[PDB]
Design a protein around this ligand. Structure first.
Ligand SMILES: [Ca+2]
Length: 223
C-alpha cells in the first residue's frame, strides 16, 4: 500500500496473509474454512496466516492453518487477468473471534464514488521498494467504469473495477495482491493489478467480487 496508513493491530480481522515460507499475497476470510484471494496468487503449499499484524513477529493472536485445497476460477485468464479470483479451503476451521473474523460477501455491486478500505503488506513506495512488517490501510473511492476504461484502454473487463486516485500517490501495490477492498462492510474487490503503483492516471484495478457471489457460494456448498 502506497500513501496509506498503519491500520492498527487486528483492526482488519478478515485480512489474511498467504505464506509459502514468506508472505506473498493477501486474502480475505469469508467463513471459518474459506479464504478469497486472487487467482494470480495461486501456488501449491500455501499456509494461511490469520490474526496477523507484524508478519515477522509472533504477537499472540495468530492462527496458522495450511490450505487443503485451492480453486482457481474456471474462467481465469492469466494473460488478461480476467476473473482474477480463487478460493482457498483451510485444513481445519479457524477459531473466529474479535481479531479473526469473516467479512460479508456483497448482495449487490457497489457504485462509483463509494469509499472503501484496501489493505495489505505490499510495497509502500511508488518509486523504489520498501516492504512493511505491519498491516497498511488505504481509504479510497471506487472510480467510474468509464474513467477506468479510459485509463486502461482495451484492458478493463466487466469483471474489473478501478479504485483510487487519478492524481497518483495513493494505491495498492506488489504484495497486496489478493487482498481486500471492503466497502460498507462488504468485500467488493480483490487487489488485482495496475500500471506500476500510485502512478498518475493509472489507478488500481480490482476483481469485481459481486459478479462471483453465486460461484463462491455454490463452490463452498460442495467442497
Ligand atoms: Ca505476527
Amino acid at each position: 500500500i502506497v500513501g496509506g496508513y498503519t491500520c492498527g493491530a487486528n483492526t482488519v480481522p478478515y485480512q489474511v496473509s498467504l505464506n509459502s515460507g514468506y508472505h506473498f499475497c493477501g486474502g480475505s476470510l469469508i467463513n471459518s474454512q474459506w479464504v478469497v484471494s486472487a487467482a494470480h496468487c495461486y501456488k501449491s503449499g500455501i499456509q494461511v496466516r490469520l490474526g496477523e499484524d507484524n508478519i515477522n513477529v509472533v504477537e499472540g493472536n495468530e492462527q496458522f492453518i495450511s490450505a487443503s485445497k485451492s480453486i482457481v476460477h474456471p474462467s481465469y485468464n492469466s494473460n488478461t487477468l480476467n476473473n482474477d479470483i480463487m478460493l482457498i479451503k483451510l485444513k481445519s476451521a479457524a477459531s473466529l473471534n474479535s481479531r479473526v473474523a469473516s467479512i460479508s460477501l456483497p448482495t449487490s455491486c457497489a457504485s462509483a464514488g463509494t469509499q472503501c478500505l484496501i489493505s495489505g503488506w505490499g510495497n509502500t513506495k511508488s518509486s523504489g521498494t520498501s516492504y512493511p512488517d505491519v498491516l497498511k490501510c488505504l481509504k479510497a473511492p471506487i472510480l467510474s467504469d468509464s474513467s477506468c476504461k479510459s485509463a486502461y484502454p482495451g484492458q478493463i473487463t466487466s469483471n474489473m473495477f478501478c479504485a483510487g486516485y487519478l492524481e497518483g500517490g495513493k494505491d495498492s501495490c506488489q504484495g497486496d495482491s489478493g487482498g481486500p477492498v471492503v466497502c460498507s462492510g462488504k468485500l467488493q474487490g480483490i487487489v488485482s493489478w495496475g500500471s506500476g503503483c500510485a502512478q498518475k492516471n493509472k489507478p488500481g484495478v480490482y476483481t469485481k467480487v459481486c459478479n462471483y457471489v453465486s460461484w463462491i457460494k455454490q463452490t463452498i456448498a460442495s467442497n
